[PDB]
Amino acid sequence: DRIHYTGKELSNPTYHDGQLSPVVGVHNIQLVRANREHPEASNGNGWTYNHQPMLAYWNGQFYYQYLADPSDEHVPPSQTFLMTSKDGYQWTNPEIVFPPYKVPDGYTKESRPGMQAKDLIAIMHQRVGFYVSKSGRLITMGNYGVALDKKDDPNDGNGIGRVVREIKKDGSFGPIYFIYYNHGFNEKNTDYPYFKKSKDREFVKACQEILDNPLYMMQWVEEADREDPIIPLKKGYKAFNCYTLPDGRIASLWKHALTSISEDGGHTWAEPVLRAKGFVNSNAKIWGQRLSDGTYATVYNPSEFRWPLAISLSKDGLEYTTLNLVHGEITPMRYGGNYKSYGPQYPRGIQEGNGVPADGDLWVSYSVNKEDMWISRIPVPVQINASAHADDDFSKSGSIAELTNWNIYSPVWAPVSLEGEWLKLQDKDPFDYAKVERKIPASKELKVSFDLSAGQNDKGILQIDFLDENSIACSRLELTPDGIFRMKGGSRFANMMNYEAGKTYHVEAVLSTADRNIQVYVDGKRVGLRMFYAPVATIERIVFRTGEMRTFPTVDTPADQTYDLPDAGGQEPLAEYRIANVKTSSTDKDASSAFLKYADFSHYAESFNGMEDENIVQAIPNAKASEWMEENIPLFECPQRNFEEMYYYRWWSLRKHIKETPVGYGMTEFLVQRSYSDKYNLIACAIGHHIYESRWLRDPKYLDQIIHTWYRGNDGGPMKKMDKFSSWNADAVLARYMVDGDKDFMLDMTKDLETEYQRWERTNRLKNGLYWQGDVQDGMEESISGGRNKKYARPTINSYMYGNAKALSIMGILSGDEGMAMRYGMRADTLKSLVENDLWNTRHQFFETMRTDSSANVREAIGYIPWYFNLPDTTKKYEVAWKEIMDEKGFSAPYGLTTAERRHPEFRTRGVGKCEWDGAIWPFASAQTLTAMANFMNNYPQTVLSDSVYFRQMELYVESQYHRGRPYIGEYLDEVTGYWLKGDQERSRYYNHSTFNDLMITGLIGLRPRLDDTIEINPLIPADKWDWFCLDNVLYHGHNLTILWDKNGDRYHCGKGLRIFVNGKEAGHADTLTRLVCENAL
């Protein structure tokens, strides 16, 4: 329908930057600095009215066109300049491309009776400057109008006409021709020939293409004859620009952000043409374009004043949702003049078809004060926030174009440059300064360090500011022209030290928003302490500026400037400053998170604390839970409320189970006191789940102690009641190691795990080698396959021992113990063979319990446990077991996965309310099944299960975890009705007998933990399920990981697709949700 802005960000005209934070890495580069007193080829020979830039990119070079008069708008003479650049930073001198033109003596207008042209030069005015033809030729164009006096309008449709000339590869120009005559002008009374007279056929064709292109005729309407047939839309909407939407329609913009749409390539336009809703814009043009990443951007003055120059982003070219700074400085206007107004203005970029700059970035031309010509480079994809702290070595960059993480403001007479290890700021400009800004992650506690050298100590100024997102500086450091390094404390200053020229000082600044103070160190010694002179919530920028900010102009400054500033073309004596080795860091609890912040998720803990009573308090009360979460949890978001809420709930729930004991932390299963528990209410049944879930907690002390408590907490030895439940704990301890990388913890636990393994091996094997367990001792009383006081070979304990054996073999190799590797690897091969040969039921095609004589002939959830440890072979015959996931007669039920196949005649025949494992949904089991299903989907060539199937079962697990309208994790539930089968009984509340977030992290998001330095992800989310999601703040192998997905690029503004970050630096990328492997990125 129409271009519009729905962002809530407004620009405040009382500040020159609008209080807008800039996008990352914007370089503002001055191209032309007007100087009447010292005219030179490089400044257009002293002309001080310079305005209306045009931009193209052709044959590896930028072409920058602008117009100029000696001092006053519409006061002749008037001409058009051209400049070129390979890189956008270093430009050739302005070259006159269309020169002053004689208005014929005797010219008149109806609006000026009695006047005639005599010895009068025309006024130039163009809204379009460039066309690249189909044959790859570059045409530049301009137009001549007539101003009979100061007040006359050259764009009245009574002008002379429009001219063109070819720009050639070699830098030369072809001859000037007229392409359009205003009424009354023709070949016989104009001073350049008509374009059709050229003997260059291909040039003539190139010009003819301009005339046949309605998008170009739309940009001739202001100067062309009124009502001229060749103009598609005849109303004088101003400074037309357009771009192509993703569906191929064309969206237009004009001054005041008037906007329309064309469905026929620009021949006709939708009425009524109205201002783009929500856009703040006035008279100084708005530029819109498609970017190289497929998204869209507008650049404009978001204001009734011509400042700042800002950028708004859109994923689709219609809805714009952001507002940030491009250019926020205002050079003072040095030379007065007719219609010159203050600030950066008249933005204009490259038309579609007129070239794509090789760096992929967004380049926009504009003037400042209609006096100085500028360009800005904006990196694409356009990033709002910094995802990592600074740690910058400038010697690694050959030129400023490589300072992707620095915002740079570089006037011709105050340029920014590199000099080996140094970022250098120079300043000889009495009216401007050099300025660099390092945007960093918004921080409450901040350290900033850098090396600093000044080329002098008796002149110049350097201000160093620490800024929030609204340009509030909380503190300022200054190198003064009387040789003092000082800090601003309020109205007064702290003089910290005298500084000398040519000396390198190591500066460290420590800022705390909560304590509201800054401490400054030089060469390791504290030299300054002060309160912030302005309070801020967080600090996001460090700014280095070779001057004081000017308050002029304000919203109260008069519009017109008739004076020149004193010494308008003079110089200041040169001041230089150099910085190197810029580092920032934060001790904020969530500083390790690159995109997500805990403050946006703390509402979950708060809601959970308020929604119901706290029945039982262990080591971490509800009152401490949010703080604990902020320290310990990876952060997650997605667009589906229930998944996100469950993520946070299950962490909040798990945390209740951390218990203080005289031997350190323990982890409970039931919060209520159980009569069969070991010391400190410990129950061994779900330890494997406890470790798999808890391995993601960032502070290792909890899980270190929980494990040591089980194995050493009973007079230095293992808890006695570990013998009451089957164990996959050696597998779980290796799984922990694969997340945290802590070799010494794992190596030190090896003997304890061997002792555990050997006990089970001694007590629980049949003569044939298979393990037996009573179903009660798997924690699964009243199963169909069964075994209260039976010695059946269940695929529970056999797979677990397979897993423990395999894990202990691997721990042997990591120990350097090759004997142990073989001893346990042999046990693993032995058990794998026994499970495959003896527990695979060939009638059912399913792993099942082996009773004394024959199979139990019941498909149970326990039959999927072999895949929890990747036990089975890749052969096709085992696949078919997984079909029962999608069969209502198998495991598929309305609330998720049953513990026994629904077709079985003994399904749920042993009563209710007393913990029965003959069919009801048990999260303990669902978690096993889902872990196994993920392994199967990741590690096996497999055609039975899609992502939709896995996602759907995770969704049902989510939906099942509610009770009385609130998140709830209990013991077990009805597969058809969803009823949690202990009802409102206290015992079930916050049950810790399963995983959830381990499944979210390793299956759904798909982080696959490994022993090596390679990162492997493979999300099992279908294509088009979620437009975005992110898992952040993950502590994996001593590094902080982020995994994110952003289909349209607008959730995180770091590009489209699937991305992995390591400590906030991108490590890999894919266009789709699919397997992504980053080799040796750790």
Binding partner of residue 231 among Ca ion, Na ion, none, CB under 5 to 8 Å per kind? Answer: none
**In whole angstroms, how close is the CB of 34 to Ca ion at the nearest point?**
16
CB of 1076 to Na ion, least distance (A): 35
State which residue, 543 or 738, has the beta carbon closest to Na ion: 543
Please give the Cα distance from 122 to 931 (Å, whole number).
79
**470 interacts with, out of Ca ion, Na ion, none, CB within 5 to 8 A per kind:** Na ion
Nearer to Ca ion, 54 or 861 (CB): 54
Please identify, using beta-carbon distances, which residue of 64 and 972 lies nearer to Ca ion. Answer: 64
Contacted by 289, from Ca ion, Na ion, none: CB < 5 to 8 Å by type: none
Asked whether position 371 contacts Ca ion by CB under 5 A, the answer is: no
DSSP string, 132-194: E-TTS-EEEEEEEE--SSTT--TTSS-S-EEEEEEEPTTS-B---EEEEE-TT--GGG-SS-B
The answer to whether 61 and 362 have CB atoms below 8 angstroms apart is: no
- 21 contacts 541 by C-beta, under 8 angstroms: yes
Which ranges in 153-301 belong to alpha helices (H)? 201-211, 214-217
**Binding residues for Ca ion restricted to 427-446, rule: CB under 5 A:** 427, 429, 433
> Shortest Cβ distance from residue 326 to Ca ion (Å)?
19
| Contact with Na ion (CB under 5 A) among 12, 283, 456, 470 | 470
Q: Is residue 376 within 8 Å of residue 395, measured between CB atoms?
A: no
User: Which partner in Na ion, Ca ion, none is near 544 (CB below 5 to 8 A by kind)?
Assistant: none
- The 3 state secondary structure assigned to 416-468 is EEEECCEEEEEECCCCCCCEEEEEEEEECEEEEEEEEEECCCCCCCEEEEEEC
Residues between 20 and 59 that touch Ca ion (CB under 5 A) = 54
- β partners of residue 475: 466
**Min. distance of Cβ 250 from Ca ion in angstroms?**
16
| Rounded distance between C-alpha atoms, residue 641 and residue 1029, angstroms | 12
Pick the closer one to Ca ion by CB: 351 or 538. 351
- The site string for Ca ion over 288-317 (x = CB under 5 A, - otherwise) reads ------------------------------
Site string for Ca ion, 128-157 (x = CB under 5 A): xxx---------------------------
Residue 130, binding choice from Ca ion, Na ion, none, Cβ under 5 to 8 Å by partner class: Ca ion
Output 28 or 471, the one with its CB closest to Na ion.
471
Distance of closest approach, residue 542 Cβ to Na ion, in angstroms: 17
Q: How far apart are CA 212 and CA 196, in angstroms?
A: 15
Q: Which stretch binds Na ion (CB under 5 A): 181-189, 315-323, 469-477, 562-570?
A: 469-477
Q: Which residue has the tokens 């070595």?
A: 393
Q: Is 469 near Na ion (CB under 5 A)?
A: yes
Q: Which CB, 429 or 754, lies closer to Ca ion?
A: 429
**C-beta closer to Ca ion: residue 433 or 1026:** 433
- Distance of alpha carbon 1050 from alpha carbon 318, whole angstroms: 13
Cβ 277 to Na ion, closest distance in Å?
22
Taking the complex as a whole, how short is the minimal distance between the CB of residue 828 and Na ion, in angstroms?
59
Q: Which is nearer to Na ion, 15 or 173 (CB)?
A: 15
User: Taking CB under 5 A as the rule, does residue 1046 contact Na ion?
Assistant: no
| Partner from Na ion, Ca ion, none contacting 469, C-beta within 5 to 8 A by type | Na ion
Based on CB atoms, which residue is closest to Ca ion, 412 or 893?
A: 412
Least Å distance, CB 957 to Na ion, is 41
How near is the Cβ of 7 to Na ion at its closest, in Å?
11
Location of structure tokens 């305005």? 51
- 737 touches Ca ion (CB under 5 A): no
Of 905, 931, 917, nearest to 998 by C-alpha is: 931
Within 411-430, which residues bind Ca ion (CB under 5 A)?
Answer: 427, 429
If contact means CB under 5 to 8 A according to the sort of partner, which of Na ion, Ca ion, none does residue 901 touch? none
Q: Tokens representing 881?
A: 């077991």
Task: Determine the interface stretch with Ca ion among 196-204, 253-261, 359-367, 539-547 (rule: CB under 5 A).
Answer: 539-547
Minimum distance, C-beta of residue 127 to Ca ion, in the bound complex (Å) = 8
- Cα separation of 478 and 468, whole Å? 19
- Cα 264 to Cα 229, 232, 258, 473, 1049: the distances in Å are 18, 11, 19, 51, 29
**382 touches, from Na ion, Ca ion, none (C-beta below 5 to 8 Å by class):** none
CB of 988 to Na ion, least distance (A): 48
DSSP 696: T
Task: Give every CB contact of residue 943 below 8 A, 6+ residues apart in sequence.
Answer: 879
Q: What does the per-residue mask of binding to Na ion show for 10-29, with x meaning CB under 5 A?
A: ---------x-x--------
19 or 929: whose CB is closer to Na ion? 19
Give the gyration radius of the chain's Cα atoms. 36
The two three-digit tokens of residue 547, written as one number: 């001057």
Residue 131 binding partner per list Na ion, Ca ion, none, with a CB distance cut-off of 5 to 8 Å that depends on partner kind: none
Q: Are 20 and 328 in contact (CB under 8 A)?
A: yes
Q: Return the DSSP state at 276.
A: P
The smaller minimum CB distance to Ca ion, of residues 571 and 1072, is found at 571
Nearer to Na ion, 555 or 617 (CB): 555
Indicate the residue among 469 and 645 with the shorter CB distance to Na ion. 469
Find the shortest distance in angstroms from Cβ 599 to Na ion: 17
Contacts of 1024 (CB under 8 A, 6+ apart): none
Per the structure block, which two tokens stand in for 587?
Answer: 């001790």
Q: Name which of Na ion, Ca ion, none residue 129 binds, using a CB cut-off of 5 to 8 Å depending on partner kind.
A: Ca ion
In this structure, the strands spanning 406-410 and 27-32 are parallel
Beta bridge partners of 243: 251
What residues contact residue 826 under an 8 Å CB cut-off, 6+ apart?
Answer: none
Strands (E), 539-698: 539-545, 575-585, 635-637, 658-659, 666-667
Note whether 680 and 669 are within 8 A (CB): no
Which residue's CB is nearer to Na ion, number 14 or number 758?
A: 14
Stretch that binds Na ion, among 202-210, 455-463, 464-472, 758-766 (CB under 5 A): 464-472
Q: Which entry of Ca ion, Na ion, none binds 97, CB below 5 to 8 A by partner kind?
A: none
Q: Fill in the per-residue mask, 54 to 93: x = in contact with Ca ion (CB under 5 A), - = not in contact.
A: x---------------------------------------
Q: Which residue, 128 or 318, has its beta carbon nearer to Ca ion? A: 128
**Closer residue to Na ion (CB): 19 or 78:** 19
Q: How many residues bind Ca ion (CB under 5 A)?
A: 8
Number of residues interacting with Na ion: please give it, by CB under 5 A. Answer: 4
String of contacts with Ca ion for each residue 971-1000, x by CB under 5 A? ------------------------------
Shortest Cβ 442–Na ion spacing (Å): 11
Q: Which residues of 514-532 are buried (b: 16+ CB within 10 A; e: fewer)?
A: eebebbbbbeeeebbebeb
547: contact with Ca ion by CB under 5 A: yes
Shortest Cβ 432–Ca ion spacing (Å): 6
Decide: helix, strand or coil at residue 350. strand
Please measure the distance between the N-terminal and C-terminal CA atoms of the chain and give it in whole angstroms. Answer: 47
Cα–Cα distance, 287 to 381 (Å, whole number): 18
Please report the beta strands in 851-984, taking only residues with DSSP state E, as ranges in sequence order: 892-893, 896-897, 962-963, 966-967
CA distance 54 to 73: 18
Q: What is the dihedral of CA 879, 885, 888, 892, to 10 degrees?
A: 170
Q: Which of residues 470 and 938 has its CB atom nearest to Na ion in the complex?
A: 470
- Where on the chain is the footprint of Ca ion (CB under 5 A)? 54, 128-130, 427, 429, 433, 547
Q: Which residues are at the interface with Na ion (CB under 5 A)?
A: 19, 21, 469-470
